[PDB]
Design a protein around this ligand. Sequence first.
Ligand code: HEM
Length: 153
Amino acid sequence: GLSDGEWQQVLNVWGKVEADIAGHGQEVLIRLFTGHPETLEKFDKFKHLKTEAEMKASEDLKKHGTVVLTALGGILKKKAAAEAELKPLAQSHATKHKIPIKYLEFISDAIIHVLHSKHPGDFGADAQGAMTKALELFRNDIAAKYKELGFQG
Ligand code: HEM
């Protein structure tokens, strides 16, 4: 349950991410993989990557980072009426990639960490709270569909 003012902070924050999406997606994935090497084993494309520098040099990693943030933004722009956008995500990540909720938590922490890091004095308390709630809603909505799909998560 986010207010309309809270959603409008989410949409503003996400507008800043989309205007600089290559860097944002790259730092989010790197924060995820260095902080939680177990999540890397889910990416056939990336599991060969060992150091942060290899990660910063992969055009593929940068490309997929933009796929991630772009898809997340589509969900966030629907702000609590996002069922159509969550469905194919939950479908593929439950049925095909097999991503536990715990990893969606990791990537949410990473997004917030990158948002703090990249926007000094421009990512204030209202925006942080709003983003934290929006990402919590996303993970919960996915976990609910995970169960309808018979995937533990
Ligand atoms: C905010 C969270 C996430 C978003 C918005 C997101 C979005 C996407 C999208 C749009 C795709 C491509 C189409 C698809 O397969 O559905 C994808 C692929 C994938 N996702 Fe995620 N994803 C998220 C989290 C994660 C996490 C945390 C993992 C952890 C391992 C993961 C593992 C994968 C894999 C393995 C693929 C296929 C990659 C490939 O083509 O080689 N996803 N994701």
